[PDB]
């Protein structure tokens, strides 16, 4: 009968935006986040990054990007936004001793954009981005 109590933690959750990845289930793979070159919008995130590709394998057929452009190689994302359970109370970090509720903002899915060829007012302009680590 663990009666653990839930803090209605007011620690600002306006910052909290869930990011989803219906992309990377194959081998528990992650982004190894930095890899930054980071670009993000507040509304329709469109997270554009430095998902530079590995190099151990033989050259990864770099002639592909060299056909048009690869300047290592960004594997960027456009956020498939959703309106969803974020406003239910969309919980957060939970120990076995403490429980901190925080109400998030709109969840956004993330997927590669395949750039093979009114947010622009300021939301699309916003990508000055720094994904970084701080125990907080």
């Amino acid at each position: 009968v663990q009666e653990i109590d839930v803090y209605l933690a007011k620690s600002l959750a306006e910052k909290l935006y869930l990011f989803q990845y219906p992309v990377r289930p194959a081998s528990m793979t992650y982004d190894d986040i930095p890899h930054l070159s980071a670009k993000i919008k507040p509304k329709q995130q469109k997270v554009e990054l430095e998902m530079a590709i590995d190099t151990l394998n033989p050259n990864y057929c770099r002639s592909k990007g060299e056909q048009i452009a690869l300047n290592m190689d960004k594997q960027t994302f456009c956020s498939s936004q959703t309106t969803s359970n974020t406003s239910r109370y969309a919980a957060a970090l939970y120990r076995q001793g403490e429980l901190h509720l925080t109400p998030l903002h709109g969840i956004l899915q993330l997927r590669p954009s395949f750039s093979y060829l009114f947010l622009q007012k300021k939301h699309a302009e916003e990508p000055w981005v720094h994904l970084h680590y701080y125990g907080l």
Binding site: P22, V23, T82, N85, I107, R111, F114, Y116
Partner: protein
């Protein structure tokens, strides 16, 4: 008092507010009441394109009842006699106030007739409701006429009830050759037919309403971009067979090319056939892949109603997974199942015609407005020029009379709907009413949907068949089988957001997971994720069963597929049933001294979980029992009574046990036309074949359902002494030696009338 009498005295309890005919009057009452205002919501608001915006605006269109009540017979009030003799028609004008957005500013709100509603005789506007068999003298009419039939130039025209299959619903058949995912949706507008096919050896394409050819699905999923084709395959499924079988289509698409949306979709941008309307796209020169994608908001053409295309994506990706029925050779989904067939009814056809005649009149008003610009006068929109008034009259009467609901917006020029009441007695006067008529049945002589399916035990009669051509194709909705019109989907959306039904925009193609039972079909409308069907469904039942949401909202829990429906839309048959409470029927053997004498006023056996309303589906879930006497303790509902599958015209045989089925089909055809006492009107009226008797006699081996008809006050045949005896070679193949001296003493007169006009 006993265990039994309770369940056989629920009949006069529900046969008063919603009984045997009264579905007709209920539907049309609502359609007078509110649905006409609903169609008023299709206001004009477009009429002044080349104008200083002199739009009209219907303030409130009611059937003679904006601020008025006695406008329900507007020929100086007139009974059905003064309509069956003078040959006149019922008429109530569909009056309305209008809200000229006039540039000369006279916002004129006069009550303007827009036509006439042919009022169903004995609706909640007629002068024959709430009246006693004494008040039925000055109105020349019986108290116990069926009621619900129209007045067409002095001719009683009933409206046969059709059986048109459900909209909004996948139909995953299995041809002997290949599977067919044919989701024949609608939007109350048109028979849109966005069918998928198992086309060519694992190759999937869409015979959309228009599109010029067969479009490989993976390109379709591109059109609602999920471009990470990994996501396509993982969403369609995660097992071996599904992935492998779908593989060929992604392989063919990629071998063509893999592009995102701005390319490889010109492959469908030009391959579109609704491009055939080059002249129908006069403005918006913007027309190609991106632009049939801009007009791909209507490329919904399905129940699911979003702008971010993930809803249509998952709809196609459950389509594509419920067309590959995991080697769809063993899985079969049959058409003729009365959860699928939803009865469109006299009122519903009148609602289509409400919609279409008001829109046609508004279109001609729009045309007059769009030509009247040179007129510098005030009467660009004025009532005086607004003068098709009382010509919706002709449209309605032509529809009800010729039987032609001739249309343009709904793609059906139906003919053969309305018929004339066979007033040979009041037995066939009912049998004509409460009749359901079949529909396409693609090859009607291919007798698949001709034998009576076990799927409406109750709701349609077993023995009412006109042997010949209309056997199994004209149907008597013959008893207790209540009927639903429409609901509000909102207060199930709320219980979905609460009760543990997720938002599908929080998950991806996990949807092959057996704990995750994920049919949540709120009337076709999209879907709901969360698991725990065996709690959502059961608490939803046990929430409506206690005074909350209106007891009609059936929910099926099938386990072969992950089926949990929420069907809260029209056309549904129904029935009442006694709640067993899983151990013992919740009527407690002593509701009789409330079922009969004083109180539990009534239908308050629906606000107490005591007796409740099923559908076909929910009957496919529950476990009913015939009698209490043989309940075995797993039963969910209880039969009120066995004798109400045999219905109003068909429950006339005495002891229909012992006869064959052919014999009761014969009788339940013959008994209709048999000469009888038309009732109480007879002499006051004039009508063609009033085949009276002169000395009729009540039945004498009668049935508890002969009383309920009230048509044992009006018996149709003499009651005859009879032997069983072979006289002399004339009797032989069903022939009768009827003695004279009883024809002489009056056995079986006739009073054949006829009519010269």
């Amino acid at each position: 008092i006993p265990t039994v009498e309770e369940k056989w005295r629920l009949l006069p309890a529900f046969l008063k507010v919603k009984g045997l005919v009264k579905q007709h009057i209920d539907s049309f009452n609502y359609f007078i009441n509110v649905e006409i205002k609903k169609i008023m919501k299709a206001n004009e608001k477009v009429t002044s394109d080349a104008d200083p915006m002199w739009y009209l605006k219907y303030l409130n269109i009611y059937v003679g009842l904006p601020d008025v009540e006695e406008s329900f017979n507007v020929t100086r009030p007139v009974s059905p006699h003064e309509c069956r003799l003078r040959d006149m028609t019922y008429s109530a004008p569909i009056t309305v106030d209008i809200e000229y957005t006039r540039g000369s500013q006279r916002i004129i709100r006069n009550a303007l007739p827009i036509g006439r509603m042919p009022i169903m005789l004995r609706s909640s506007n007629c002068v024959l409701t709430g009246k006693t068999p004494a008040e039925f003298a000055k109105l020349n009419e019986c108290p116990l006429d069926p009621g619900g039939y129209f007045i067409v130039k002095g001719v009683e025209k009933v409206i046969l009830i059709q059986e048109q299959l459900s909209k909004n619903r996948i139909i995953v058949e299995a041809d002997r050759k290949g599977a067919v995912g044919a989701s024949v949706t609608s939007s109350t507008h048109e028979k849109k037919s966005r069918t998928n096919m198992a086309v060519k050896q694992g190759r999937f394409y869409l015979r959309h309403n228009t599109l010029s050819e067969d479009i490989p699905i993976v390109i379709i999923f591109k059109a609602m971009g999920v471009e990470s084709d990994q996501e396509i395959v993982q969403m369609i499924g995660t097992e071996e067979h599904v992935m492998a079988a779908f593989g060929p289509s992604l392989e063919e698409c990629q071998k063509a090319q893999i592009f995102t949306q701005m390319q490889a979709l010109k492959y469908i941008g030009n391959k579109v056939r609704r491009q055939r309307m080059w002249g129908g796209g006069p403005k918006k020169t913007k027309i190609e892949e991106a632009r049939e994608l801009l007009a791909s908001t209507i490329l919904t053409h399905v129940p699911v109603k979003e702008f971010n295309f993930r809803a249509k994506c998952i709809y196609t990706a459950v389509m594509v997974r419920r067309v590959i029925l995991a080697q769809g050779d063993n899985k079969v989904d049959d058409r003729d199942y009365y959860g699928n067939k939803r009865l469109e009814l006299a009122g519903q056809l009148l609602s289509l015609l409400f919609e279409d005649l008001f829109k046609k009149f508004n279109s001609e008003m729009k045309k007059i407005a769009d030509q009247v610009i040179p007129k510098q006068r005030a009467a660009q929109f004025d009532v005086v020029k607004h003068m098709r008034q009382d010509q919706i009259t002709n449209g309605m009467v032509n529809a009800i009379s010729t039987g032609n609901w001739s249309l343009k917006r709904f793609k059906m020029d139906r003919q053969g709907v309305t018929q004339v009441l066979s007033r040979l007695s009041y037995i066939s006067a009912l049998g004509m009413m409460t009749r359901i008529s079949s529909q396409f049945e693609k090859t009607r002589k291919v007798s698949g949907p001709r034998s009576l399916q076990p799927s409406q035990w109750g709701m349609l009669c077993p023995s009412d068949t006109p042997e010949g051509e209309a056997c199994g194709l004209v149907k008597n909705l013959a008893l207790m089988t209540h009927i639903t019109t429409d609901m509000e989907d909102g207060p199930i959306v709320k219980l979905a957001s609460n009760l543990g039904v997720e938002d599908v925009n929080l998950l991806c193609g996990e949807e092959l997971s057996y704990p995750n039972v994920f049919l949540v079909f709120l009337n076709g409308n999209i879907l709901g994720v969360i698991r725990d069907h065996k709690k959502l469904v059961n608490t939803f039942r046990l929430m409506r069963r206690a005074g909350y949401i209106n007891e009609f909202v059936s929910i099926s829990t099938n386990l072969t597929d992950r089926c949990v429906y929420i069907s809260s839309d029209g056309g549904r048959l129904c029935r009442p049933y006694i709640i067993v409470k899983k151990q013992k029927p919740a009527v407690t053997n002593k509701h009789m001294e409330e079922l009969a004498q004083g109180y539990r006023n009534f239908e308050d056996f629906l606000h107490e979980s005591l007796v409740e309303y099923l559908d076909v589906n929910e009957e496919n879930d529950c476990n009913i029992a015939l009698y209490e006497h043989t309940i075995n303790k797993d039963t969910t509902h209880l039969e009120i009574e066995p004798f109400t599958l045999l219905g109003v015209c068909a429950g006339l045989i005495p002891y229909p046990h012992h006869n064959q089925s052919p014999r009761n089909t014969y009788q339940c055809a013959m008994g209709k036309q048999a000469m009888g006492t038309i009732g109480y009107n007879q002499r006051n009226r004039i009508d063609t074949l009033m085949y009276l008797l002169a000395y009729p006699q009540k039945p004498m081996v009668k049935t508890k359902t002969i009383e309920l008809i009230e048509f044992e006050k009006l018996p149709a045949g003499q009651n005859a002494t009879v032997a069983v005896m072979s006289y002399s070679g004339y009797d032989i193949e069903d022939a009768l030696v009827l003695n004279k001296a009883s024809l002489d003493r009056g056995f079986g007169r006739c009073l054949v009338y006829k009519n010269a006009k």
